Design a protein around this ligand. Structure first.
Ligand code: BR
Ligand code: BR
Ligand code: BR
Ligand code: BR
Ligand code: BR
Lengths: 104, 104
């Protein structure tokens, strides 16, 4: 039985800083296939690391958070490259909907 | 934000010819993406108590993920219905029950 805790947070940063988090893939997907979300892995991208005291950190984001939406756009099946580009477009403002999965 | 309790269930239904599986399938634009809140396009609108589906553990609100091994998360209504009637009196379905608990 899974418990998925969801929330939408707003990240606001300065021009000379980053959002303070690193994104990686959930599993070792094969490039010849689309990602299939499951309760344990609801999104292709997840936060692999968050700098303590950084923008993402202060907003409540933590390692383990799965990325569901970027600036109102669903990115559950979207790759790293596109997500980075999407985040760039937003400049110093980034809205993300994330989920933390628990209880196995 | 909200908490989403997720319970996945895979059952095997077997019915007589003088009966149906005992459920009303409803289809949730035809290009959607699964999210923890809404994991699939088709879901059980109704399930007859004491029916084949009911006795197997299926309940109103369950989202259809697979029909006879085939992922139907993003498949249309007519197509899924055909897949179900294909197996005849036998239907193996994987579903996910989602209950939302809003934050306050
Ligand atoms: Br899918
Ligand atoms: Br791109
Ligand atoms: Br790309
Ligand atoms: Br969600
Ligand atoms: Br549909």
């Amino acid at each position: 039985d899974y418990i998925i805790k969801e929330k939408t947070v707003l990240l606001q940063k300065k021009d000379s800083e980053g959002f303070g988090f690193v994104l990686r893939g959930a599993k070792a997907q094969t490039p010849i296939e689309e990602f299939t979300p499951t309760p344990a892995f609801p999104a292709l991208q997840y936060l692999e690391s968050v700098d303590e005291g950084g923008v993402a950190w202060r907003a409540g984001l933590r390692m383990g958070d799965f990325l569901i939406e970027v600036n109102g756009q669903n990115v559950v099946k979207v790759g790293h490259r596109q997500v980075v580009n999407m985040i760039r477009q937003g400049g110093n403002t980034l809205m993300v909907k994330v989920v933390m999965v628990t209880r196995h």
